[PDB]
Design a protein around this ligand. Structure first.
Ligand SMILES: *[C@@H]1O[C@H](CO)[C@@H](O)[C@H](O)[C@H]1NC(C)=O
Lengths: 48, 48
């Protein structure tokens, strides 16, 4: 401080800037038929 | 809402394909040959 005053940069002109932000709120609802995935249609696999 | 067990469309018919007119292997004629070799000189025949 000089004489109790400080040097500061104060804006003399301005613009508006736009910044986008994607926030994920959902995701693909994946479903699995465990029986069809593990064994297809083979009765020998479905029994086990 | 209930997702049921996955069904598969069942076969309407069957397809069977093989090379026609192939000769008999005659495996019995070679196995029944009376000139039987010993384990020391085991004989081999390839059937194709
Ligand atoms: C602010 O900036 C714009 C673009 O350079 C200019 O047209 C405008 O005259 C400026 N205003 C001042 C007060 O400097």
């Amino acid at each position: 401080s000089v004489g109790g005053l400080y040097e500061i940069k104060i804006p003399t002109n301005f613009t508006i800037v736009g910044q986008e932000e994607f926030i994920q709120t959902n995701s693909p609802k994946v479903t699995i038929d465990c029986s069809l995935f593990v064994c297809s249609n083979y009765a020998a696999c479905h029994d086990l | 809402v209930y997702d049921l067990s996955g069904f598969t469309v069942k076969p309407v018919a069957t397809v069977h394909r093989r090379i026609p007119d192939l000769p008999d292997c005659d495996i019995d004629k070679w196995l029944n040959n009376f000139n039987v070799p010993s384990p020391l000189n085991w004989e081999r025949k390839i059937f194709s």
